[PDB]
Amino acid sequence: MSIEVRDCNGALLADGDNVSLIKDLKLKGSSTVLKRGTMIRGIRLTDSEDEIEGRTDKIKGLVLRTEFLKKAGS
Structure with missing residues (x-):
C-alpha cells in the first residue's frame, strides 16, 4: 500500500498534517x-493520492x- 500524497511541490502529507x-x-x-x-491544517489522506481531506476556518x-x-x- 503506497498512497503517498504530496503537495504541489512534493512534500509528503499524512493524517494530522497541514497545508x-x-x-x-x-x-x-x-x-x-x-x-x-488560506491555511488548511489537520488534513488526512484519502482513497486518493491526489486528494486529501482537511478543514478550514469556515469549511471543515x-x-x-x-x-x-x-x-x-516546513
Missing part, C-alpha cells in the same frame, strides 16, 4: 472564492485535490 493554498481557488457553491494563503471536513496545496509549516 495551505498556493493560489486562489473558487468554488461554485454560493460563489466561494478561496484565496492564496472538505476533500480537496492537493495539486494546489502546499505543505505548511
Whole structure:
C-alpha cells in the first residue's frame, strides 16, 4: 500500500498534517472564492493520492485535490 500524497511541490502529507493554498481557488457553491494563503491544517489522506481531506476556518471536513496545496509549516 503506497498512497503517498504530496503537495504541489512534493512534500509528503499524512493524517494530522497541514497545508495551505498556493493560489486562489473558487468554488461554485454560493460563489466561494478561496484565496492564496488560506491555511488548511489537520488534513488526512484519502482513497486518493491526489486528494486529501482537511478543514478550514469556515469549511471543515472538505476533500480537496492537493495539486494546489502546499505543505505548511516546513
